[PDB]
């Protein structure tokens, strides 16, 4: 799961560690299992989430 998430996030301008920090600073609690499942099936949902993380650590 972690390697698939890294692969997907680097396509949205992030890396794995910065995106995990961003999701924690926003209070999102998705598994790494559902995150990878989204990364392969629903790219638009994965981008919604990556934008929320990018705005969280923009402070």
Partner 1 sequence: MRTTYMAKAGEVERKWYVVDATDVPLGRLSAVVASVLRGKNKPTFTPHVDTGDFVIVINADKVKLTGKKATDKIYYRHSMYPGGLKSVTAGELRDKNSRRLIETSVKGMLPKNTLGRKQFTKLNVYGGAEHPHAAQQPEVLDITN
Tokens at residue 56, please? 């969280």
Does 36 bind partner 1 (CB under 8 A)? Our answer is yes
Does 19 bind partner 1 (CB under 8 A)? Our answer is no
- Residues 37-56: x/- map of binding to partner 1 (CB under 8 A)? x-xxx---------------
Query: Residue numbers of the site for partner 1 (CB under 8 A)?
Result: 1, 3-5, 7-8, 10, 33, 36-37, 39-41
């Amino acid at each position: 799961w972690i390697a698939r998430i890294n692969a997907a996030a680097r396509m949205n301008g992030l890396s794995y560690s910065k995106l995990m920090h961003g999701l924690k600073l926003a209070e999102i609690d998705i598994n790494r299992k559902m995150l990878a499942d989204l990364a392969v099936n629903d790219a638009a949902a994965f981008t919604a989430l990556a934008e929320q993380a990018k705005d969280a650590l923009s402070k």
